[PDB]
Amino acid sequence: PTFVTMQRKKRVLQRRLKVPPALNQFTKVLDRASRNEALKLIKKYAPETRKARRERLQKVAEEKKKDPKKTVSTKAPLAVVTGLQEVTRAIEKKQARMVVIANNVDPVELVLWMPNLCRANKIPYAIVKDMARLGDAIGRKTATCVALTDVNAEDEATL
């Protein structure tokens, strides 16, 4: 089928032609051993699901209704920053201890500037092998980038 031929021919001339440094940097990914450990830390601080978030807010509502005078915190448990808009703000405000960027984002212009933005802000970053593996860690289908803003005390040595 024409789509089978064109996806294979695509890969051929991404190697035949001279690729500038801004795109070649995504073919030089983090090694497998460190990629697995990073994904395990991202999965440990994955965002809460729809069910988990709504049960937490339901409890917070009850603790609010127990005494309307006192204010109950609605803060979510510590997790990773996920999403192009939110991860970018963590870099610009310099709240990200580490940023994990996926190498196969298409269009590449979504994240082509993340290595240069992290480098300008002196923020550790890594380009990893799949955006679906990043999505699996956080519980979605795909993920362009993930930032770790903080970890618990028992996970500071791992970070």
Partner 1 sequence: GAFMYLNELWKKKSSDVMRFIQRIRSWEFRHQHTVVRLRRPTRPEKARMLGYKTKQGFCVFRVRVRRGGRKRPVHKGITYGKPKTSGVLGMKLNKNNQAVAEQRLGKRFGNLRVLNSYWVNMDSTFKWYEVIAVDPMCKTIRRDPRINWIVNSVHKHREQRGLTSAGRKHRGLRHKGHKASKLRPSYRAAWRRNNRIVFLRKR
Task: Tell how strand 98-102 and strand 125-128 pair up.
Answer: parallel
Residue 73 CB, nearest distance to RNA (Å)?
11
Residue 8, contacted partner among partner 1, RNA, none, CB below 5-8 A by kind: RNA
Give the contact letters, 67-96, x = binds to partner 1 (CB under 8 A), - = no. -----------------xx--xx-------
Say if residues 145 and 81 touch (Cβ distance below 8 Å).
Answer: no
Q: How many residues in the shown chain lie near RNA by CB under 7 A?
A: 51
Exposure b/e, 43-61, CB count within 10 A at least 16 = b: eebbbeeeeeeeeeeeeee
Q: Site for partner 1 (CB under 8 A): which residue of 1, 4, 8, 13?
A: 13
* DSSP label of 123: -
Residue 28, contacted partner among RNA, partner 1, none, CB below 5-8 A by kind: none
Please state, in angstroms and as integers, the Cα–Cα distance from residue 123 to each residue in 37, 83, 100, 155, following that order.
19, 17, 11, 19
- The answer to whether 132 contacts partner 1 (rule: CB under 8 A) is no
Residues of this chain that bind partner 1 (CB under 8 A)? 2, 6, 9-10, 13-14, 17-20, 22-23, 84-85, 88-89, 107-110, 112-113, 117
